[model samples]
Target: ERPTFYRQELNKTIWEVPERYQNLSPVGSGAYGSVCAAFDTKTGLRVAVKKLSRPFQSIIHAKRTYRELRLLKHMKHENVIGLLDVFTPARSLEEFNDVYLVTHLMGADLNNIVKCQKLTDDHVQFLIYQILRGLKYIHSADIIHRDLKPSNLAVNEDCELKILDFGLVATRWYRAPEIMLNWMHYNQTVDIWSVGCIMAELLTGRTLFPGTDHIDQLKLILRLVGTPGAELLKKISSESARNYIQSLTQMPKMNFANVFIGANPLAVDLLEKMLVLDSDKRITAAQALAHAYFAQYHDPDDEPVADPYDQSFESRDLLIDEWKSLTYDEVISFVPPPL
Candidate 1:
């Protein structure tokens, strides 16, 4: 059931949106819920309002909703999607429910752009550079945006990229090797692996490892990079996983240049480092920003500095209901009185 925060009557599904904002059109929809492109009457600014779909349906859903809200509220970066306003249409704490998040309306998702438009080297470099820049900021904040697929990235006509959809979930095609192999403790490098896959897709206009399943995904990765090194294999906690990897035929690693035909050599060089089988060996987001591929746009002044207020929520030992309560309190207490 959907939250009846804005219910006009005692029993209804039609939640009333704030009078200041007018819903223009349905922009997108998925597990999180539907988003609408809206115009704020008072502010006269176009915004994307995403409504959480049954956020309290399950423990996982509740926690994820809370996590996404907290991250978006605190992460302040040019390349990260900004949360402008949050509201729920309820008179009392008891009646309070549902969430409506307002953000800057982006032109389109990167997925649609990559599919429909052919990109030049300049386009590829600028786009990927922004992603790395965003990643650098996120990593410095001690947060890993586990999902880094094309759809999770928003872009405009000017090639401005903003990273979105940050939770503990990810698409299989862009999943890192360490995550696929079930490494005991994977680090932020998991995102780097995803960037490599995204880079390949941008260059070739197709997904690099479009596996049907987890096993198939591993096989596809092995086909590209061969099996992991003996040292890396020894680190595997699961014997079955280790043996399963070793059981595969030793395929030679594909040359990055050949895989990304006609791409700049520097770009391919960065791709190789980002796609390393071992998470430990993966190039960092900061390092990726310094790569020669982005030399044309890189500026020493653009290097990211750690945000003193940046915090990680992974350590919060709260139950799902507690998270729900916190969210309710956050929404109720959000925004200060206008003087």
Candidate 2:
């Protein structure tokens, strides 16, 4: 029950969080973790605290947690969610179990907002512009957001946007063609495809692709993108998938302006570049930000690029104690911001 807080009272969470974070109430949960908004005594602010569920259980997940932590610490931008604090309630190495990460708290995610009401054209343009600004840094780090959908975005009443949940990957509808075909060598452009889908959704209040099955999903994509030619099909490593795609009836590509009728022309132009079948030919976040659609919002100076990430440690499979030791160091080194 973690019966310790400002009032020395029980918090709403089962995890043993430190006394400094009080009034904890869960707001969300995912496969590997849960989240709550709490009042931080030291920072004198409301913050979102994410509790890593069994972070040390599997080597795969352990490495993933480490990767997310490393990137979160490396990240520094207004559009990307920044880590403010991290802590563990465990007092000794033997008792070590939970790791909690803290960050700025915002209102509902973009998904809830998108589902509820309509937004103005200006609203859509600015929201997408901020996403590109954030991705400019995330991609520079050689890390793909993996998942980039409206739902993953966090927004406030003032239209301030911040991206979150980089810990996980994609939704089927937002997946790129190469990803759906199981192409091995795909890189960061996989994210652009998602942005295109998001852009389409923002123009129209419905999901772009809502396929029922794997086969159905690909067909829906092929239906919209039209069937890719043999040149692009050759890139798919899965021969069966290639054969399946080739066998499908070829259709002409639909114009974005027609699909998103009466929407802004420049916005549609940017969407076309992002939704390209070939990953190599896809628009990058940086380039997308510079599109005519975002001229008013674009600023090369305001958009920052991070040093590329080091993926070398992913090869190492170490003992739990070593992992625990390193993670503990990371947790303890975080001093609360000065008063």
Candidate 3:
């Protein structure tokens, strides 16, 4: 699918932006984009602005990037980020232009929370359970959030998790079965695989599959899941992941229980089933919702607070650091909860 590109209107005046946005300030920056906090000058509703360096130059990028926005536009679950608007730059640039995605800003991504604060197993379990719930919803829509790392998952002040970052979300780490076997078309299960990696990261405060390189990543995977049989490996990698296994030289069988010390056994079991080397054996998001680990988790409907940021007890500091990256004025308009 091709992403639609628009030519900048040369003489157009920037009047559509609400007067309230005049105080707009930036929040964070990354490889291809930046985010800002802005409020409707009149209504005072807080909104986040995610500006892409340029609209997708390629159709695939455009489609996938917009696909997330489109998906969010139609989706109304509490775990999903809310989309308010999608604004194009008043004008365009020659090589690159900006596309602004408006959303509701919340707390920090899951990585920062795990790294910056200490928590109990209950905290970790509470956090992961919320994320899986979001993933289950996304998969039900026939979408694969290829990227499922902690950095992409946001935690509110209440400790509720909201899945963020649609970029790199398709299939971060495809396992042996997925690599070797042709399943014709892959499905939402890939997102579950990512959840496995993220779960590991949450437990140990380190990436479960922190491969130095692709080869290294493959080795890490093999070590945990056990190297695929020779014939299966041969069928999967025509070029050879053997070089990957060869680099490791007989990896020990990975025991999920050993990887996450003190993590709840039930949580560990769920992770194992989700991260199975073979995608076929990996549980579907729906099946995951029914797992015991999730059975104990509260459903979005049953949860009292609708918007996590509105609750005094919820977590809202996650995006504060990134929010600092924006202008002081912008930060002021962010509608931070009163202390």
Per-residue CA lDDT of candidate 3, range 35-94, in tens? 666675544566676665433555444444444444545445667675665544333223
Off by over 4 Å in 1: 1-15, 166-170, 306-321, 333-339
- Candidate 2 lDDT, 1-339, residue by residue in tens: 332523222244475677878888778776778888889887788888888878888776677677667767767778888788887778767887778788888767777777788778898899999888888888888878877777688887788888884642238888887777777788999988988988788888888888776778788887777888767776777779877887888877887788878888888899899988888889999989889999888988789998767867767888777777667777777654434
Full ranking by TM-score: 2, 1, 3
Q: What's the distance in Å from true for residue 82, model 3?
A: 3.0
Query: Compared with the true structure, what per-residue lDDT tens digits does model 1 show for residues 242-264?
Result: 67888888777887788777888
Cα error, candidate 2, residue 89 (Å)? 1.1
What is the model-wide C-alpha lDDT for candidate 3?
A: 0.58
